[PDB]
Amino acid sequence: KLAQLQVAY
Amino acid sequence: SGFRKMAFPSGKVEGCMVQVTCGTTTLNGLWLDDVVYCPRHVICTSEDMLNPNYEDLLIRKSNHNFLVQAGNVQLRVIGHSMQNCVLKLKVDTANPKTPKYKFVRIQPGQTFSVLACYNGSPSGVYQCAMRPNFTIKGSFLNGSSGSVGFNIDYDCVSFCYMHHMELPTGVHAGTDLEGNFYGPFVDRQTAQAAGTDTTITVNVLAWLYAAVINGDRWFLNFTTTLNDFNLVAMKYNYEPLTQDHVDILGPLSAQTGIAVLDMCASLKELLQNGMNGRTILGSALLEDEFTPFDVVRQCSGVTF
Amino acid sequence: SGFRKMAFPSGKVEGCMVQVTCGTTTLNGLWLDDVVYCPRHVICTSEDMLNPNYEDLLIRKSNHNFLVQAGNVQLRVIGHSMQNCVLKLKVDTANPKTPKYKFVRIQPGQTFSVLACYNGSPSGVYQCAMRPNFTIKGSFLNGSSGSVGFNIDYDCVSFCYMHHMELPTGVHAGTDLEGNFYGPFVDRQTAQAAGTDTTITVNVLAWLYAAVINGDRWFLNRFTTTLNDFNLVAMKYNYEPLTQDHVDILGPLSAQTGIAVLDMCASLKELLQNGMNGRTILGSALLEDEFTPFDVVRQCSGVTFQ
Numbered sequence A: 001k002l003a004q005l006q007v008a009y
Numbered sequence B: 001s002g003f004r005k006m007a008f009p010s011g012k013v014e015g016c017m018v019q020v021t022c023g024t025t026t027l028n029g030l031w032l033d034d035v036v037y038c039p040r041h042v043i044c045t046s047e048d049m050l051n052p053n054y055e056d057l058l059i060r061k062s063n064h065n066f067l068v069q070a071g072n073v074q075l076r077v078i079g080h081s082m083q084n085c086v087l088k089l090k091v092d093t094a095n096p097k098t099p100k101y102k103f104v105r106i107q108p109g110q111t112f113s114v115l116a117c118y119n120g121s122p123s124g125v126y127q128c129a130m131r132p133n134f135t136i137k138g139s140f141l142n143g144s145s146g147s148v149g150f151n152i153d154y155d156c157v158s159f160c161y162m163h164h165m166e167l168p169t170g171v172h173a174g175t176d177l178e179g180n181f182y183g184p185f186v187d188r189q190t191a192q193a194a195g196t197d198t199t200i201t202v203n204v205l206a207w208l209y210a211a212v213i214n215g216d217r218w219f220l221n222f223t224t225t226l227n228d229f230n231l232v233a234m235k236y237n238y239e240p241l242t243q244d245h246v247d248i249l250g251p252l253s254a255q256t257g258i259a260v261l262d263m264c265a266s267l268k269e270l271l272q273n274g275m276n277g278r279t280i281l282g283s284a285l286l287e288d289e290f291t292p293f294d295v296v297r298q299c300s301g302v303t304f
Numbered sequence C: 001s002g003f004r005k006m007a008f009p010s011g012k013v014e015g016c017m018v019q020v021t022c023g024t025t026t027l028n029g030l031w032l033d034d035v036v037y038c039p040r041h042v043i044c045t046s047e048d049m050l051n052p053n054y055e056d057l058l059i060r061k062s063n064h065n066f067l068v069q070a071g072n073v074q075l076r077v078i079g080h081s082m083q084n085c086v087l088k089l090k091v092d093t094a095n096p097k098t099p100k101y102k103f104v105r106i107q108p109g110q111t112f113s114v115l116a117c118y119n120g121s122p123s124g125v126y127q128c129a130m131r132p133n134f135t136i137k138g139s140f141l142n143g144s145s146g147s148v149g150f151n152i153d154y155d156c157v158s159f160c161y162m163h164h165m166e167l168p169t170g171v172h173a174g175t176d177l178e179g180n181f182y183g184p185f186v187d188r189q190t191a192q193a194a195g196t197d198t199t200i201t202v203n204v205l206a207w208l209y210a211a212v213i214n215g216d217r218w219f220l221n222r223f224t225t226t227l228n229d230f231n232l233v234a235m236k237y238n239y240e241p242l243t244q245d246h247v248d249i250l251g252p253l254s255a256q257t258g259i260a261v262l263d264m265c266a267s268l269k270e271l272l273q274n275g276m277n278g279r280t281i282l283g284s285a286l287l288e289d290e291f292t293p294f295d296v297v298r299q300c301s302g303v304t305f306q
Helices: B054-058 B201-213 B226-235 B245-248 B250-256 B262-274 B292-300 C054-059 C201-212 C227-236 C244-257 C260-275 C293-300
Strands: B015-022 B025-032 B035-039 B066-070 B073-075 B077-083 B086-091 B102-103 B111-118 B120-127 B150-152 B156-166 B172-175 C017-023 C025-032 C035-038 C066-070 C073-075 C075-085 C085-093 C100-103 C111-118 C121-129 C146-155 C156-166 C173-177
Touching: B015 B120, B025 B201, B035 B156, B035 C035, B054 B077, B066 B077, B077 C054, B077 C173, B102 C054, B111 C111, B120 C293, B201 B245, B201 B250, B201 B262, B201 B292, B226 B262, B245 B250, B250 B292, B292 C121, C017 C121, C025 C066, C025 C085, C035 C156, C054 C075, C066 C075, C066 C085, C111 C156, C201 C244, C201 C260, C201 C293, C244 C260
Parallel strands: B102 B156, C100 C156
Antiparallel strands: B015 B025, B015 B066, B025 B035, B035 B086, B066 B073, B077 B086, B111 B120, B111 B150, B150 B156, B156 B172, C017 C025, C017 C066, C025 C035, C035 C085, C066 C073, C075 C085, C111 C121, C111 C146, C146 C156, C156 C173
């Protein structure tokens, strides 16, 4: 549903 | 003999991948000479992602906040700026494995190899196309941000893609290496939609020529005009074929002695009457992620 | 998310590829430490190939009958030996780009990356399965011999394949890096033929699981089958028999999705008996069998709740 900016944590 | 979806050899690009970290936020960067390029959303926390003020968030950062690792080795950041949706982090060491390279903005329907990276470490490599709707159909998990798409043009690495985001439909969006987005997409975690997709007609024609080069002839037959072909092409949601498309399918046409318009007639029938439990080059669909030069590289055994 | 045929990064292997020339034959070698490994058919003339006595042919050769090039630099050959069907060329310099590596033998149904090479230089990298009949469906042209198949685990390269030849049906045959052929093949010029191929069932099921994780459900049904009832359909359509080891290795994908393995088996039976009817699965109109369960989890990276 929402765009994901594909950083890790 | 045989035909595979073939990626470029990746070793030149593997020596350039590094891990960029801001606080707890981590992604990948591209170490070329004494600059590390990476997506700007490395400066975001999970709660900044809705509509970040990049300009403000950066003013708040110092060189010492950006932790850069190339394998085990630590790289001192000595300078920082933002160009569109990329950070450029000046570091104190030039990458001694910088290949000859350029930055190119590629056209929809062009292919490239993706080196998927996690924690600054290459994990996988696969061939991709810039779809007409400016998205790619990738395989990317969280942490893949900063992974790059590239071509090898003779002796020179052509960087054409840095990975930023996954859209809701599961397709992928990113920038050229000058931080500009392919398509109308922004680096915000918002409800963004892809536009109407289309089959890359010139690629499908290039693949049928590969099938003929490899001794597959069953779909050759009738001869059509350019305008009659395109009436059919767009009912099937194919890109209209231009006279420049016909021009660049010239080498393949000459080599096979099949006139481009005779191959358009072949395609027209396949679109209308289907593949009827047949296959072409191991596939029971019409493949659109082989460009003309892609077919020549694999079929003639071009090395780098 | 998304799902692609994904090769391992080829860098660690590229740094080991050399060109070996003996007489009028050129192919690829693999340069690890002070040895170059290549197919031993490099020492043979056309006449020799018809009935090669490799022991007798190799003792007749001098170190200088072998021209080894690492890009622009000739490697000096200081010794030659033979292990099964691979030629080990001892060279005066150790490859300073030799990665951490092991030689492994893979089983039918397992996958690896191929770095297709000519004149010691890389053309490209793709993913393959060892077929049940011990052939690979590669993309290989004249001069590809010595090209290797590999998997990468952390920093360690597992070399599992060296390319030797092409069979009449256009499929490919080769050895491990200890030089034993996969399958009943010999490196002499006699009539040889691939056996009956079968589809790798466990891999097609691994692939159906990947389709569901990536959003696809059209091909699911409320039915289920016994291992025995499925294998009667498996045989009809020339699939490998499914075994409890296969059902065990799918268990993690089964858990992640909540689709029991004999349920997915019921999906595959209907898919075999009806076809897809103009519909696609993960961008393919065929049932895909060159993704192992391992390969699905590498890209799907699911959690298993306990």
